[PDB]
Design a protein around this ligand. Structure first.
Ligand code: GNP
Ligand code: MG
Length: 166
């Protein structure tokens, strides 16, 4: 099987853990609310290929993590997550992009822009605004809800496909 190192990044509270947990849960534990950053694994078939996804659920840029630079060096692809009801989180996307570019010294890193919490009516970031931002980075944009599961598998599998076509 092929192993992929994925890193989930974004501002505090956008749903980085919720997304990761929704993908990787085997549901033995009913509720799991991770308090700090951690690594998770998921085996899945994507376009006929058996993949092992190593998924790193990072803390926001706000919190200190000693290993952050090495997480980014190791990471092969990045989910850049914001929340559609949090303008600040959307504006923060630039910070996360620049951090990844600074560490990896590259303009062509596999990424997916993720607008999470799309189950919510109180939207402050229009899809067209995020599509515009994604198009300026030359990356896919996908809207997700970690509550409903909408788009969650698609976001991760799109990232794997970006890594592949790199
Ligand atoms: N309505 C809604 N709430 C969501 C969604 N995803 C996460 N949340 C909620 O938003 C809050 C933050 O979720 P969490 O997964 O902790 O986000 P985080 O980005 O990992 N936070 P941290 O940076 O502190 O680790 C929680 O109350 C969670 O239930 C979603 O898709 N929809
Ligand atoms: Mg978290």
């Amino acid at each position: 099987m092929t192993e992929y190192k994925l890193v989930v990044v974004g501002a505090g509270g956008v749903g980085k853990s919720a997304l990761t947990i929704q993908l990787i849960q085997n549901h033995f534990v009913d509720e799991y609310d991770p308090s700090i950053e951690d690594s998770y694994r998921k085996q899945v078939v994507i376009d006929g290929e058996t993949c092992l996804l190593d998924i790193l659920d990072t803390a926001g840029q706000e919190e200190y993590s000693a290993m952050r630079d090495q997480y980014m060096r190791t990471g092969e692809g990045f989910l850049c997550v914001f929340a559609i009801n949090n303008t600040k989180s959307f504006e923060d996307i630039h910070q996360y992009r620049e951090q990844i570019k600074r560490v990896k010294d590259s303009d062509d890193v596999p990424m997916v822009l993720v607008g999470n919490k799309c189950d919510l009516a109180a939207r402050t970031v229009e899809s067209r605004q995020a599509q515009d931002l994604a198009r300026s980075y030359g990356i896919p944009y996908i809207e997700t809800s970690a509550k409903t599961r909408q788009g969650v598998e698609d976001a991760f599998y799109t990232l794997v496909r970006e890594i592949r076509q790199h």
